[PDB]
Design brief:
Strand content of chain B: 15-25%
CATH topology of the largest domain in chain A: Arf Nucleotide-binding Site Opener, domain 2
Bound molecules: guanosine-3'-monophosphate-5'-diphosphate, the ligand C[C@H]1CCC/C=C/[C@@H]2C[C@H](O)C[C@H]2[C@H](O)/C=C/C(=O)O1, magnesium ion, zinc ion
Organism (chain A): Homo sapiens (Human)
CATH superfamily of the largest domain in chain A: Arf Nucleotide-binding Site Opener,domain 2
CATH class of the largest domain in chain A: Mainly Alpha
CATH architecture of chain B: 3-Layer(aba) Sandwich
Number of domains of chain A: 2
Radius of gyration of chain A: 19 Å
CATH class of chain B: Alpha Beta
Largest sheet of chain B: 6 strands, mixed
CATH architecture of the largest domain in chain A: Orthogonal Bundle
Shape of chain A: elongated
Strand content of chain A: under 5%
Number of helices of chain B: 6
Subcellular location (chain B): Golgi apparatus membrane; Synapse, Synaptosome; Postsynaptic density
Protein name (chain A): Cytohesin-2
Order of helices and strands of chain A: HHHHHHHHHH
Oligomer: heterodimer
Subcellular location (chain A): Cell membrane; Cytoplasm; Cell projection; Cell projection, Growth cone
Number of helices of chain A: 10
Family (chain B): Belongs to the small GTPase superfamily. Arf family.
Structural class of chain A: mainly alpha
């Protein structure tokens, strides 16, 4: 039944994606299984059926114009309402495997931050504050849980690091302490 | 028996020393570290976040510091630049189009107040390529003769063979024992 063929060409579209995200999208587009718009590619990645999260992360981390548009659309598919920053980050970083290059993490955190702030207005005074703090949380996860780092950051150091990021002033110590404790006691889960 | 670690054998149980390694993408940092660890691999439990590439000889560690990203996150780096005795700057000497971009990155790291006292070792890497700038040419393009109050050295290297790594680290070791 003209449909099982559709399943074969989809399963083929997803594996290729897992081997090479760009080629798998091209294959899916060419075989009319997926619309070549950033919005539809993003939905496809977000649903993530049968997709390796490392391949999703690698695609979202590219700098080409379409990939940037997809990342924007991908983050728009996340609902962060009534989540604290760490809970929102956990949900976000569950949907793809974060790349390790700082330029990619930076771009991903800024995009995350814009959305976080829209979903949770007035929690931060500016999206910049949310963006810088989110990045410092990624730094904190790395510091605390990567075994190549021997001299682990304590609370005091984490507090000192975020000095000045609230539009030249400070965030409250208890907000930073709660972030610190959440990451220390539960690293970001490996997808 | 790690030839590079033996260079630092007698520092003086002195205090941990920390060296950061910086350079544009593709300059050769990862490749150098593979040589400094002598090609030995481990399966490491994964961690979400930044790639951390470090080699520890004990009494001394070398860590790649990725300078990518926007300027707004750089205030966060400050405490890590605090206990740093040396900076290794690696440049792709064949990349004539990005040498000014490398110079600007170097110059911004060297304006970090926290690095005021760090020694500087420049690896002018990729000397095996036929149109590579040599060490004397890189020195000019990076503006190293305009540096003041900075102990600096430039070493020609080929990271894929390891050539020059020993000689630059030997220079570095002699700087760090002398303080
Ligand atoms: N000819 C030459 N190449 C070198 C030298 N040093 C590093 N390379 C190559 O340049 C590429 C970038 O090196 P890498 O060490 O990943 O750079 P980085 O970690 O600073 O980004 C690698 O090639 P690939 O991406 O092809 O693996 C590496 O083999 C060198 O001295 N000479
Ligand atoms: C000591 C460990 C601390 C881990 C957290 C630091 C992350 C840095 C943040 C910077 O923007 C890029 C990373 C930079 O590349 C840090 C590398 C690294 O090994 O640092
Ligand atoms: Mg590298
Ligand atoms: Zn949008």
């Amino acid at each position: 039944s003209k449909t099982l063929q559709r399943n074969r060409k989809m399963a083929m579209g997803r594996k290729k994606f897992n081997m090479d995200p760009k080629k798998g999208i091209q294959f899916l587009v060419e075989n009319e299984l997926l619309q070549n718009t950033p919005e539809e590619i993003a939905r496809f990645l977000y649903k993530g059926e049968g997709l390796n999260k490392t391949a999703i992360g690698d695609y979202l981390g590219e700098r080409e114009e379409l990939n940037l548009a997809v990342l924007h659309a991908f983050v728009d598919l996340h609902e962060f309402t009534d989540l604290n920053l760490v809970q929102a980050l956990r949900q976000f970083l569950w949907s793809f495997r974060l790349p390790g290059e700082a330029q990619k993490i930076d771009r991903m955190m800024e995009a995350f931050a814009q959305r976080y702030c829209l979903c949770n207005p007035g929690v931060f005074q500016s999206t910049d504050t949310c963006y810088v703090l989110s990045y410092s949380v990624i730094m904190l996860n790395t510091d605390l849980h990567n075994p190549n780092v021997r001299d682990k950051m304590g609370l005091e150091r984490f507090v000192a690091m975020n000095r000045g990021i609230n539009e030249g002033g400070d965030l409250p110590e208890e907000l930073l302490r709660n972030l610190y404790d959440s990451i220390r006691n539960e690293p970001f889960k490996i997808p | 028996g790690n030839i590079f670690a033996n260079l630092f054998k007698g520092l003086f149980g002195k205090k941990e020393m920390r060296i950061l390694m910086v350079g544009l993408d593709a300059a050769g940092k990862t490749t150098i570290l593979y040589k400094l660890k002598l090609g030995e691999i481990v399966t490491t439990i994964p961690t979400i976040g930044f790639n951390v590439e470090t080699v520890e000889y004990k009494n001394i560690s070398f860590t790649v510091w990725d300078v990518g990203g926007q300027d707004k996150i750089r205030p966060l780096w400050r405490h890590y630049f605090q206990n740093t005795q040396g900076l290794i700057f690696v440049v792709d000497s064949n990349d004539r189009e990005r040498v000014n971009e490398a110079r600007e990155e170097l110059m911004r790291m060297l304006a970090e107040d926290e690095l005021r006292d760090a020694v500087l070792l420049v690896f002018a890497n990729k000397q095996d390529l036929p149109n590579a700038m040599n060490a004397a040419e890189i020195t000019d393009k990076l503006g190293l003769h305009s540096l003041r109050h900075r102990n600096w050295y430039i070493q020609a290297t080929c990271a894929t063979s390891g050539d020059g790594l020993y000689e630059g680290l030997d220079w570095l070791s002699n700087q760090l024992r002398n303080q």
